[PDB]
Symmetry: C4
Subunit: 431 residues, 4 copies
């Protein structure tokens, strides 16, 4: 019989709650200070509907410390009592039985809004809008208090000054002026503008103005703090890029760094920023625990797996392991690399693109579109020179493994090692 | 005979000292500028009680550079002399023998407050309250200076303007106005409001006001700096969470990251944020020196120790070592893990929860509530396939060990190794 | 037939676009509010030349998502339509067929500038200039709104106040005043100055001023945020240096650190700051992938390569590998180092400068200008004492290698190992 | 014949230069706008002494790009010419031959002040004083411009307003008022105060005020940025401490962390903060290159070296190695440590303090004041239990070594190994 707290009707009712909150919180001070009709019935049904809201909250489930979803509305009643229940009941209890300062039930009703502010917030802009709303409500309350003070003082007052400024000698000025000007004065001494139209004359008004500038200074400082925090959070990335640029530039300046080489270094730096954005993929990859890494590495072997004939029959564990042990050597187009006479323990395949091998003005291995090169590991397995020098060409992505790593991972499982060695296809072996 | 400086009566006396500080520092300028009775006796007994305070400070111990607690009040007298003793004696010496500017003893008495500000502070809010108190005292002093200037100039002055504004032609205005309006003018030219009620007329008050807005600008800048620092300290955590979210999002975007996999990655990311809050437990665990780590790791073996029958008879050193060398594999509910045909050097038990093992549609090992699975290490000890594939289930916490690590730690002490091998219970051996 | 989007004539035309944008945006509100001639023809040819601009954008290429450069202007048309094309069409369509609020074509024309602000920006100063331009345009618009309100209200208004202040009783004041004073009032209520010359009288201008104060507060907060971010970005380096000095100072204070030794430590600290600036070269060197490191390390072997006779015949693989594996020991002038009886596996050479070897008051090896010292490795290869103690001298750059690395890299290349051992020249072997 | 640029007389002359800079830069606008005598002679000898300064700068050396100290003043002249020489000559060339705007020589003289600002600055407070000086000079110049505008306009002006406010109907007001009020107005529209005493009347002063508040807003933003940067630099350490405390607290909360253990953890955290202040000594120690580390480690062996009899005969290489390879185990008073049945590869001595060994209610080894305990390494050298359990006592400083490290470092040096083994003293061997 109990409803769940994820019910959409509950969300609609909560939005209606917020609408009532703002409506009463703005109307009641204005009517109590500046000022029959169905509005009295509306005021009564406000508390009636908040009692109904208490009933719904008892009906709808809640989130306990241990149990996220719990039945038995009695438990809802028992935890809610002696707490938010008191606040909501006070907000729902009329005191009809003038004197409007006792109407703190509306004031305590925003405690519920502060309870649900986290649900309200989705990003930082809504926070700025919320502080703007608080700006408006604070201004309204201060203007109403100022209007009350001005009325009380009247038996040279600010009201006389207003009557002298806008033509209405006294009777007195109309109701619209006595509120627009009150808000005008409130904003006058909140943002430290200081107009000359209206200004306190009596001592009580001066003390009130003192409190006003104190509160305004505090909240204005809060606004600057939040704005500065947001701006710095946004521009931290640009500051970071400046930092990498600074280290690159100082390193280049410190070590002579001949001009063609400085040009290549800055080119590679800007290229790396283009896609990495400074953030290395290795760190985030290593942050994932075990099986996540094994699964995600296989997504990179979507270029070599399906094109290599033997690897179709491989087991899933072997594929995931070897996926953890492939490294796609990312290189900008037009790079020279390992030459003849170097080490041959670093085995190399291709993933995409194309490259050239000029072993003394002889063009070989112009392949690279999911292509295969390398050396025989069963018999030869000797370091030294394989074919010769590799030359610069278009987009350079190769496929790295290691001589020791491949053999040790392959010998653990013999049948597919035999399958791979028997079906050892190379598009162009570097010989 | 000497009292200790941690005496609560000393704390009560220090609070009375602070009360006297604020009371005199507020009252004396107001009485000297704007203004018999027991107040003269009160003023005299202020200095009398501060001499008594000097006597108590000699009686109560102090904290030396080497010795935290030291007896022999003579030592207290000797270090205190030629220093804070001079300040406190000047604060305790009356100059009765008008002219109130020589009453710098109260002004020097706040040097003691600055000496004890660190004790006063517990959190940052008290600092903001202290700066608000400085606001109030600075305002009071500047208003008193303004009132003195206004009185001195009077033989078109701002006093005449005040008499013209509030009805009191001249005689002159009452005492209450000549102070409330002074404070009003003080706050007028500190928060950059600039009202039109009161404003400087001759050169002297103009120069004084220039100094006023200079000081106001400086200290207002200080207020904004402190507020911004506090706000950024508070929201650094949210900024951090934004940073992790940014790296996750950019990594997902950069590498295609198929949709089910991106969903699992973001799910694990938010899960990790839920409890870790970015901070890995491994770093802080490794931050502790040796024995602290050994003691704290045993607190995690409160689930496997008491339920494993042989481990009751184990020696405490062996238990603390093994505690340092268990790793509870935290995994979100519904995870798949190592399959058949993989390496079996990573031995595994369970800590809490439950998991499933489907080795080709056969449900085995549905246990997990402090249960034990694995392989026999005395004879078999061979990698390969143990039982088959593990499947996704509810809350996934296992118990990680290592084949070489456990054997090397166990062979160091033979008797309990024999006990463990003899009483080698497994809830369901993966065979 | 299609033009390329990197054409300089396109850049000149875009500059003309911006010029027309600013002129139209500043002139049209002023003429529509405060205010035949060739200006009507100018206004028409504005839209005509913007239609021509649409034609040029059709002719000139664009950058697609996949293809940086794309031909076939039909593709440009199909991608451009239903989007920015509508913006420039509205900006280029006259509505001649008063009422100037419909002239949103200029207002939307700033959006096309806004998409290109990234190209316009080169550094942060241009951003500040752009926000100053926004200040000017916003002020102009708000002043025009104020002037319109003042005209509409006139059937005690601020126009009467202006006529009373500057002599022009009423007829009415001249056109120049009714704009300069409007801008003056606009700046009055944006920077929170609050002059007394002009001030709102009726309700409408009070509400308008309220809106102005809110906008000014928000955008002033934005200005402070940007300025603070820029300043902190500039002074982050000094902050880093101060933090480094704090670590050095606290370490020195914590561990006694005898005075001559503290002097040497701090001297080395500012020495390292002089060229490293905190930034270690090792991290950035290891940041480069493989071949970049091999190429860049050879730039440091421009001192010993050409002076060592056997290394001329060395293969480029030898040069790149060894250059990757030489380490120049940077040391401030006047340093003492490894003595007799120490480890001799750290084979040492020189790169530049000079040093002294006093093995009991005997001056040997005063060399160092691309000089060679060391030990025989073919036969002797024994650690212990080589010659004796090294003493402090002028600028200390040695040349570090290590015993095991050199043999294991050099034996793999037998012909050059034989060449090096046969031609093993040492300026002064430490014996 | 040439003087050196580190001459103290040069420093005195530079201070005189700065004094002349400020004196002329302040006096000349005031005399040229608001306003025979020896002051004309003073003005002439200003340029004469600046020509003398050019002569001295030629005589005194300078710092070249390569050579820090360079002789041959001809080189000084040739490097100085076409640059700072032009600025200083213009500052030293009178234009006597009214019109005071051509007196830009004083304005260009501050370019040298900006050239030497780095020498002037020692800490950040001098920077704030410099910006305050800029505040004063800018205010003075703007007030002079305002006075010039007011004088030019006079044929309702602000001069008439001033004459109406302070009694001086017109003749006209005295000179002191016409400057104090100008400066008052200048500060009025820079700090956004906005008084009502003086305010622009015609268009020209309104535009001038526009420029004034624009400059004021910009430079006020600069002031806030600098202040905030300084404050955050100061409070970064407290931020670091709070972050560390947050890590500790979240770790404690996340893992239950029984109450006595949480108390010990927080105690150790605050104890580590007491002297480390978060900064580990290991990182800074490892930052020093080689010989610095070897020298600094010996400073920690000032407690065990002189008290161990064999170590007196040790060679300095022996000493540097051994001192490098101890780690003094800092432990808070009252700690328990390695028990019986553990591993004995971690050899241990003591450096200061005292500890207890209760191997089943038997008090042994209550020593610790530069005392030695351990095991025989020649014959026994077996892990296991040595004496039993160590118990909590006062300040716990032990002396850590390692079984494998010490044997390998000591057997390399046979004679001292024999000396140490023969004279192998132990205060209490744990048996």
């Amino acid at each position: 019989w109990t409803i769940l707290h994820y019910s959409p009707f509950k969300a609609v009712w909560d939005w209606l709650i917020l609408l009532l909150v703002i409506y009463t919180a703005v109307f009641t001070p204005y009517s109590a200070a500046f000022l029959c009709q169905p509005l009295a019935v509306v005021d009564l049904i406000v508390d009636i509907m908040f009692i109904v809201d208490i009933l719904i909250n008892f009906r709808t489930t809640y989130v306990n410390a241990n149990e996220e979803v719990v039945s038995h509305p009695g438990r809802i009643a028992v935890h809610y009592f002696k707490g938010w229940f008191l606040i909501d009941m006070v907000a729902a209890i009329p005191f009809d039985l003038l004197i409007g300062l006792l109407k703190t039930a509306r004031l305590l009703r925003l405690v519920r809004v502060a309870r649900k502010l986290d649900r309200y917030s989705e990003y930082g802009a809504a926070v700025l809008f919320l502080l703007m709303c608080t700006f408006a409500l604070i201004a309204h309350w201060l203007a109403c208090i100022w209007y009350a003070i001005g009325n009380m003082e009247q038996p040279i007052g600010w009201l006389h000054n207003l009557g002298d400024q806008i033509g209405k000698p006294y009777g007195g000025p109309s109701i619209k002026d006595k509120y627009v000007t009150a808000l005008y004065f409130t904003f006058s001494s909140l943002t430290s503008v200081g107009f000359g139209n209206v200004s306190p004359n009596t001592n009580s008004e001066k003390i009130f103005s003192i409190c006003v500038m104190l509160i305004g200074s505090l909240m204005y400082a809060s606004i600057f703090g939040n704005v500065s925090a947001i701006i710095q959070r946004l521009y931290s990335g640009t500051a970071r890029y400046h930092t990498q640029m600074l280290r690159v530039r100082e390193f280049i300046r410190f070590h002579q760094i001949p001009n063609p080489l400085r040009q290549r270094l800055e080119e590679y730096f800007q290229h790396a920023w283009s896609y990495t954005n400074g953030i290395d993929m290795n760190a985030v990859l290593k942050g994932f625990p075990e099986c996540l890494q094994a699964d995600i590495c296989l997504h990179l072997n979507r270029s070599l797996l399906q094109h290599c004939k033997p690897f179709r029959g491989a087991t899933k564990g072997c594929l995931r392991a070897l996926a953890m042990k492939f490294k796609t050597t990312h290189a900008p187009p037009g790079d020279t690399l390992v030459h003849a006479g170097d080490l041959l323990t670093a085995l190399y395949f291709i993933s995409r693109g194309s490259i050239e091998i000029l072993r003394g003005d002889v063009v070989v291995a112009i392949l690279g579109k999911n292509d295969i090169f390398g050396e025989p590991l069963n018999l030869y397995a000797r370091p030294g020179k394989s074919n010769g020098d590799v030359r610069a060409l278009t987009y350079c992505d190769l496929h790295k493994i290691h001589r020791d790593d491949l053999l040790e991972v392959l010998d653990m499982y013999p049948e597919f090692s035999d399958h791979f060695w028997s079906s050892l296809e190379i598009t162009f072996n570097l010989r």
